[PDB]
Write a protein that binds this ligand. Structure first.
Ligand SMILES: *C/C=C(C)/C=C/C=C(C)/C=C/C1=C(C)CCCC1(C)C
Ligand SMILES: *C/C=C(C)/C=C/C=C(C)/C=C/C1=C(C)CCCC1(C)C
Ligand SMILES: CCCCCCCCCCCCCCCCCCCC
Ligand SMILES: CCCCCCCCCCCCCCCCCCCC
Ligand SMILES: CCCCCCCCCCCCCCCCCCCC
Ligand SMILES: CCCCCCCCCCCCCCCCCCCC
Ligand SMILES: CCCCCCCCCCCCCCCCCCCC
Ligand SMILES: CCCCCCCCCCCCCCCCCCCC
Ligand SMILES: CCCCCCCCCCCCCCCCCCCC
Ligand SMILES: CCCCCCCCCCCCCCCCCCCC
Ligand SMILES: CCCCCCCCCCCCCCCCCCCC
Ligand SMILES: CCCCCCCCCCCCCCCCCCCC
Ligand SMILES: CCCCCCCCCCCCCCCCCCCC
Ligand SMILES: CCCCCCCCCCCCCCCCCCCC
Ligand SMILES: CCCCCCCCCCCCCCCCCCCC
Ligand SMILES: CCCCCCCCCCCCCCCCCCCC
Ligand SMILES: CCCCCCCCCCCCCCCCCCCC
Ligand SMILES: CCCCCCCCCCCCCCCCCCCC
Ligand SMILES: CCCCCCCCCCCCCCCCCCCC
Ligand SMILES: CCCCCCCCCCCCCCCCCCCC
Ligand SMILES: CCCCCCCCO[C@@H]1O[C@H](CO)[C@@H](O)[C@H](O)[C@H]1O
Ligand SMILES: CCCCCCCCO[C@@H]1O[C@H](CO)[C@@H](O)[C@H](O)[C@H]1O
Lengths: 63, 221, 63, 221
């Protein structure tokens, strides 16, 4: 389970970094609507990511 | 991070799996060989598809979005191999294999076709895929599970674990289709690609590693 | 495990809704930097939320 | 959603737990009574603290941020009750109880003090709390686990499950302190409060429900 968890924990921060980069890039623009757009994507993406990680975990540490 | 960078990460992840599955299989007798070969095909095909996208090929403009043909072509080729692997564990016969591979192929064909359709009618194609997917899930958790339950303990256990991984995770793909570029485009192209890389890696390479880990244990008792 | 999962799945969308509301509220402002601020909070928050959910799941469906 | 709305959600969640723990305990003999009473104290105190914050009391301005005194006061009162519950399961003696409650109290006092300090030296106080927390974790997974392993199977199993919930989840609080208003304020006040409501609910009410579920099972065999 260990290798599974740090895989999950590490990919989450890596996904968060990608999402953050998208938000900062949109921020550099000065367009508020662009940032909202990148942010809505990041939020939906992170929610889906939970589903994936939870799915992976439930599937491997379940029976 | 650019799209091509993500595609390269996908290709490398798939290659690492492919190398692992090939080498693990070097220790395999007549009974286990086909499983290892199947895993190699699954991750190998995916590795090449990712390279194709990373090299900037198959990026198809559709209305005001970009659809990746090699993504859907990969799925058309590799998902029936995953269904095949599961069916082998379950102990299916040719007629049973035919049903699930057919249902699987309808999902992937419908999803690819829908992604390539500009108009609102692409959701009808999605819908056709979604219904076929519910049929596939039924087959996985019903009939195929019943077949698997007649086999050895170690085999039934691997089947259920891989079945659970597959049903839960494959169910996420249509939501990414709907929320991503092919649907309402609430996910950026980058987030869409990043989610699919991770998901593909778990459903192919994670799946394979779970199988590798179980195979070593069964052979070592 | 069921009641645990839909508890986790439902609180995640509820947290995502709170985060989204914060981003839209900042968006209504027209200030790009404000949106980035709400978005960075949402991203960090969602990452922490994964940790909580994963922690809860690992702790209850583990041994 | 406003802060007061979140605080009200916290209060209601804690009340629901408190009612559940009280009623579950109506079926309890001399040996189990203290556990149910402990759970009632834990969620009851938290319920009142949340009401206090929802009613707009205890919102303390500190430099350019707002710190919630009742949050930290709640923790000072309820975390030693959680440690007490764990110590009862583990079968600790008074001297062992004294050590872990002391370590626990240092964490909560340090964290509260640090939150109330405007200057950079608040991180020294955080640091003092963090070291004490590592000591508490050691006690939970070491000595206390060893003590618990001498008790019945059902008791050892509950201890490990609640110990795991506690160690993993309590470890998240200092990151929320660091990233939230008391630290670098990257989490908005709203996200900070929302995370703490959820986390408090799991560490108190979730903890209690896990215990309730185990207690019913042990008594029913
Ligand atoms: C290695 C790649 C894998 C396992 C791909 C799985 C993809 C699916 C399960 C896709 C399912 C879809 C639906 C159920 C509806 C139509 C949209 C699809 C094709 C994304
Ligand atoms: C019901 C409330 C609970 C279980 C609160 C738990 C809070 C903690 C474990 C806090 C720990 C902290 C540190 C380890 C460092 C200093 C900051 C604190 C007080 C947030
Ligand atoms: C794992 C599936 C989650 C899909 C996104 C849920 C939230 C959608 C809101 C629109
Ligand atoms: C080890 C191969 C690299 C895998 C990177 C996967 C990144 C997924 C996108 C987030
Ligand atoms: C350990 C095996 C190394 C050679 C495997 C080559 C697989 C390439 C797949 C394309
Ligand atoms: C530029 C548009 C052209 C799209 C052509 C698609 C290219 C083929 C993609 C193949 C991906 C799957 C690889 C499977 C074979 C091994
Ligand atoms: C759960 C996430 C929903 C995202 C929005 C999807 C909008 C279209 C949904 C249609 C799905 C069924 C197909 C209907 C065909 C007409
Ligand atoms: C997607 C919802 C499907 C509802 C059917 C539930 C079947 C449960 C089988 C046990
Ligand atoms: C063995 C019992 C049959 C389970 C049927 C599950 C239905 C799945 C619906 C999708
Ligand atoms: C708790 C286990 C979950 C198993 C899911 C299997 C069924 C998947 C249903 C989702 C199919 C996508 C269609 C979504 C339309 C909106
Ligand atoms: C107890 C079952 C053991 C499961 C081990 C397999 C865990 C797989 C983790 C995901 C790997 C995804 C691909 C990573 C690319 C390298
Ligand atoms: C569960 C703990 C996660 C804390 C946030 C991690 C990312 C911090 C980046 C700064
Ligand atoms: C049932 C009591 C209400 C609980 C709501 C918890 C919300 C946590 C913040 C996200
Ligand atoms: C079922 C018990 C109802 C009365 C409990 C009162 C608890 C109040 C806690 C403050
Ligand atoms: C306006 C600033 C004043 C802060 C006063 C704090 C009020 C007391 C909070 C009590 C919370 C814990 C309740 C425990 C007793 C039951
Ligand atoms: C992991 C998240 C880090 C967020 C930034 C925290 C910045 C301060 C960290 C200091 C922690 C140790 C205390 C040092 C005392 C000087
Ligand atoms: C926070 C990192 C602590 C490192 C010590 C690891 C102890 C492992 C015990 C087994
Ligand atoms: C029973 C073995 C002792 C485990 C010590 C764990 C150390 C935790 C570090 C924090
Ligand atoms: C895999 C199990 C994890 C158990 C965690 C127990 C140790 C917690 C360490 C974090 C303490 C907070 C200090 C963070 C400083 C940056
Ligand atoms: C197998 C162990 C059973 C655990 C059941 C307890 C699950 C608790 C779920 C979290 C509840 C948090 C508080 C909710 C407020 C109502
Ligand atoms: C990646 C490795 C997966 C290995 C899974 C093996 C599952 C099938 O099991 C194999 O089937 C053979 C009959 O066909 C028999 O020799 C044995 O039951 C077994 O070796
Ligand atoms: C919320 C309910 C938690 C119940 C946990 C019970 C754990 C302690 O167990 C109790 O200890 C008694 C001795 O003190 C004995 O009568 C029995 O071992 C048991 O009833």
């Amino acid at each position: 389970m260990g290798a599974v968890f740090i895989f999950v924990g590490a990919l989450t921060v890596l996904f968060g970094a990608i999402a953050y980069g998208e938000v900062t890039a949109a921020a550099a623009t000065g367009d508020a609507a662009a940032v909202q757009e990148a942010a809505v994507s990041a939020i939906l993406g992170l929610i889906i990511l939970l589903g994936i990680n939870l799915g992976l975990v439930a599937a491997t540490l379940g029976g | 991070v650019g799209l091509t960078t993500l595609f390269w990460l996908g290709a490398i992840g798939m290659l690492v799996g492919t190398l692992a599955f090939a080498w693990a299989g070097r220790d395999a007798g007549s009974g286990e060989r086909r499983y290892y070969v199947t895993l190699v095909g699954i991750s190998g095909i995916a590795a090449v598809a990712y390279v194709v996208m990373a090299l900037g090929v198959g990026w198809v403009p559709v209305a005001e979005r970009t659809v990746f043909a090699p993504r859907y072509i990969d799925w058309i080729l590799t998902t029936p191999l995953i269904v095949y692997f599961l069916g082998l564990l379950a102990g299916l016969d040719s007629r049973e294999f035919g049903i699930v591979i057919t249902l699987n192929t309808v999902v992937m064909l419908a999803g690819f076709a829908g992604a390539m359709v500009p108009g609102i009618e692409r959701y009808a194609l999605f819908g056709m895929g979604a219904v076929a997917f519910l049929g596939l899930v039924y087959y996985l958790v019903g009939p195929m599970t019943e077949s698997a339950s007649q086999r050895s303990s170690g085999i039934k256990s691997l089947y259920v674990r891989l079945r659970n991984l597959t049903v839960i995770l494959w169910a996420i793909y249509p939501f990414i289709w709907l929320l991503g570029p092919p649907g309402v485009a609430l996910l950026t192209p980058t987030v869409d690609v990043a989610l699919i890389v991770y998901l593909d890696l778990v459903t192919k390479v994670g799946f394979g590693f779970i199988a590798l880990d179980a195979a070593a244990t069964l052979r070592a008792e």
